[PDB]
Structures are given as structure tokens and as C-alpha cells.
């Protein structure tokens, strides 16, 4: 179990850690989060009490280094940093566990939710979508735009998701126009899976990361990316059977975890009605269709 300590909490803020969250009052004696499960990526995220504008946060993996949070009063935000000095970090953290100044990552033992939302997400791939190579952790906020959004404006601060575009020369083989537009298997299997992602695990990893950025930061371009990656699979007549079964599980846990009150903005009615009821895979997502129908029957 690992720890993300804090120098202080000088401003009132709601802090999230994965799917959990808690309020910290201005100058409350808070010095971080302990008992963070090893083996998963994590996200620690922030919403200031005085400006709900800009949710922001940091993706990290405690196996990759010792990370802590310090408020920067010049830039006005909680920043993640790395301490090179291990012995000092252990010594400073222990002092805090002894004074009980940390909240405990509150994982129920039955609960596989975080695993199920991050199964294919790896820090190395996050760091290629979020380019800032001098840090081992990655910053994301509500306003960051994606590479594709910028094509339709700061490149260093972009989300470099894989561009998917159904009316593009990449998607459509000369002479197979109708075939490739109405059945996207070529684009899914040859162009994206074999060509760009190499395997379905990397595809699912980006899909899961896009969903989590949409949910936790309200990042609109991430939501677009999540839906496009769903739609590319559902609009393919030919999909490996293991991929469909895994997609059903992935989406099930995403829909299960989604705040009931964010469904209106985070779920695209056209994509979901198409995927569940018209697409080639309309009958291949049993778990996802059942939870969608019982939780969000309005959308459909």
C-alpha cells in the first residue's frame, strides 16, 4: 500500500481519489491519502470550493516513484511533484501516519470497481496521450482539447487520442466506399487494431482512459473519443468474439459507475441507441443493454 502526502491544504477543495471524494476545509490539517492499492493506475483530482470551474487532476502509478501534492499560490492549484530522496520521503510520510493526518483509500474488499474501470489502462500509454515527459504522472483538466478537436489551440496541452473519423480516406478503401462506410470492420481490424493499436488491450486502454477523463473532469473531447471508439466496434460486422465479450464488461462497469445526474451530458443518445438497437452488435452487449435499460431508459 502506497501514500500520496500533502505539504498542506491552504484552500478549500473537494479531493477525489479514483471513484472516491472528500471535502477539505481551508487550512484544515490534511496531509494526504494512504493505503492506495498497488497494481493499478490512480487519479487524484481537485475541484476548488470557490471556483467549480476547472476540475483538474493527476494520473499516476506509485510503482513509478514517490509523489506528493503541494499547493502553489502563484499558479493557484494543487500540484503533483516527485521527491527523488526516498529515505526523506519515507521519514516525512511515517511522521504523518503517526499523527493520523491522512485519509485512507477506502476500498471495500468485495469491490472490483476500480480494477474493472482501469483493466487495460497503463501509465506508459497515458503518457503518450498526455505529453509532458519530464514528469512520471500526467495532468488533465476539464478544458484540455484533443488533437482532433484542434484540427476542426496549444499543442503541448492537448490530449493526443487516436484520431477516428468515419468519413476519412483512412477509414474508406478506394473502391469499397459503400462497403467500408456501412461495415467498419476494415477500419477497426486492419487500420486501427493491426495498424495503430497493435492489439485490443491497447484499444480498450485508450477507451477506458477517455471515459475516465470524461467522467472525472467533464472533458468533452474525451467523451467524444469514448463514444467514437464504442461506435467503431459496434458498427463493425466482424469483431473477435473475445473483444465483444470484454467490451460488454467494460461498458457495464462504466455505466454502473456513472453519476446518475451526469447521464444527460455524458451519454450521447444517438451513439447508444445505434449501438444497442441498430448496429451489427445490437445483440452482443447483453450486460450493457440490461443496465442501460434499467438505469437510463429515458435516453432510449
Partner 1 sequence: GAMNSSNYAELFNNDIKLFVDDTNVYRVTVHKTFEGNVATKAINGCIFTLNPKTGHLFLKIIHTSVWAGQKRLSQLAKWKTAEEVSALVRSLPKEEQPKQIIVTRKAMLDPLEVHMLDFPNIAIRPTELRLPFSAAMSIDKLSDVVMKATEPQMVLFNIYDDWLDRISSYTAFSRLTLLLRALKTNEESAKMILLSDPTITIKSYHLWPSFTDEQWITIESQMRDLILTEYGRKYNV
Ligand X SMILES: COc1ccccc1C(N)=O
Name the site residues for partner 1 (rule: CB under 8 A): 167-169, 172, 177-178, 181
Is the CB of 169 or the CB of 270 nearer to partner 1?
169
Q: What is the dihedral of CA 291, 295, 297, 300, to 10 degrees?
A: -60
Q: Which does 102 bind (CB under 5 to 8 A by kind): partner 1, ligand X, none?
A: none
∠ CA 58-60-66, rounded to 5°? 110
Is the CB of 170 or the CB of 249 nearer to partner 1?
170
The count of C-alpha atoms lying within 13 angstroms of the C-alpha of 207, restricted to the half-sphere facing its C-beta, is: 29
Tell me the closest approach of the beta carbon of residue 62 to ligand X, in angstroms. Answer: 13
Q: Nearest residue to ligand X, using CB? A: 83
> Which residue, among 83, 44, 30, has the nearest Cα to 217 in the 3D structure?
44
Q: Which does 172 bind (CB under 5 to 8 A by kind): ligand X, partner 1, none?
A: partner 1
Tell me the closest approach of the beta carbon of residue 174 to partner 1, in angstroms. Answer: 8
Q: Which three cell numbers stand for residue 72?
A: 502553489
> Which residue, among 57, 26, 103, has the nearest Cα to 216 in the 3D structure?
57
Q: Which does 178 bind (CB under 5 to 8 A by kind): ligand X, partner 1, none?
A: partner 1
Q: Which does 30 bind (CB under 5 to 8 A by kind): partner 1, ligand X, none?
A: none
> Which residue, among 61, 64, 98, 72, has the nearest Cα to 7 in the 3D structure?
72
d(CA 17, CA 288): 26
Q: Which does 68 bind (CB under 5 to 8 A by kind): partner 1, ligand X, none?
A: ligand X
Interacting residue ranges for ligand X, rule: CB under 6 A: 5, 7, 68, 83, 88-89, 92-93
> Which residue, among 45, 59, 49, 50, has the nearest Cα to 216 in the 3D structure?
45
Is the CB of 33 or the CB of 233 nearer to ligand X?
33
Tell me the closest approach of the beta carbon of residue 181 to partner 1, in angstroms. Answer: 5
d(CA 233, CA 239): 7
Tell me the closest approach of the beta carbon of residue 182 to partner 1, in angstroms. Answer: 8
Is the CB of 84 or the CB of 169 nearer to partner 1?
169
Is the CB of 181 or the CB of 296 nearer to partner 1?
181
d(CA 109, CA 145): 37
Is the CB of 90 or the CB of 264 nearer to ligand X?
90
Amino acid at each position: 500500500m502506497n501514500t500520496v502526502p500533502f505539504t498542506s491544504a491552504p484552500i478549500e477543495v473537494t479531493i477525489g481519489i479514483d471513484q472516491y471524494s472528500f471535502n477539505v476545509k481551508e487550512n484544515q490539517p490534511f496531509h494526504g491519502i494512504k493505503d492506495i492499492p498497488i497494481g493499478h493506475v490512480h487519479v487524484i483530482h481537485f475541484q476548488h470550493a470557490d471556483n467549480s470551474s476547472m476540475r483538474y487532476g493527476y494520473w499516476f502509478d506509485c510503482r513509478m516513484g514517490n509523489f506528493y501534492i503541494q499547493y502553489d499560490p502563484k499558479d493557484g492549484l494543487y500540484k503533483m511533484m516527485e521527491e527523488r530522496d526516498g529515505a526523506k520521503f519515507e521519514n516525512i510520510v511515517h511522521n504523518f501516519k503517526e499523527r493520523q493526518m491522512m485519509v485512507s483509500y477506502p476500498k471495500i474488499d468485495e469491490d472490483d470497481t476500480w480494477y474493472n474501470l482501469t483493466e487495460f489502462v497503463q501509465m506508459d500509454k497515458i503518457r503518450k496521450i498526455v505529453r509532458k515527459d519530464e514528469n512520471q504522472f500526467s495532468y488533465v483538466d476539464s478544458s484540455m482539447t484533443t488533437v482532433q478537436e484542434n484540427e476542426l489551440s496549444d499543442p503541448a496541452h492537448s490530449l493526443n487520442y487516436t484520431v477516428i473519423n468515419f468519413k476519412s480516406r483512412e477509414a474508406i478503401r478506394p473502391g469499397h466506399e459503400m462497403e467500408d462506410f456501412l461495415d467498419k470492420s476494415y477500419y477497426l481490424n486492419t487500420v486501427m487494431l493491426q495498424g495503430i493499436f497493435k492489439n485490443s488491450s491497447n484499444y480498450f486502454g485508450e477507451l477506458q482512459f477517455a471515459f475516465l477523463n470524461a467522467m472525472f473532469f467533464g472533458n468533452y473531447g474525451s467523451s467524444l473519443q469514448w463514444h467514437a471508439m464504442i461506435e467503431l466496434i459496434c458498427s463493425s460486422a466482424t469483431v473477435p468474439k473475445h473483444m465483444l465479450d470484454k467490451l460488454d464488461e467494460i461498458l457495464y462497469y462504466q455505466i454502473k459507475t456513472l453519476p446518475e445526474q451526469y447521464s444527460d451530458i455524458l451519454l450521447n443518445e444517438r451513439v447508444w441507441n445505434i449501438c444497442l438497437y441498430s448496429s451489427f452488435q445490437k445483440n452482443s452487449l447483453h450486460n450493457t443493454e440490461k443496465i442501460m435499460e434499467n438505469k437510463y431508459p429515458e435516453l432510449l
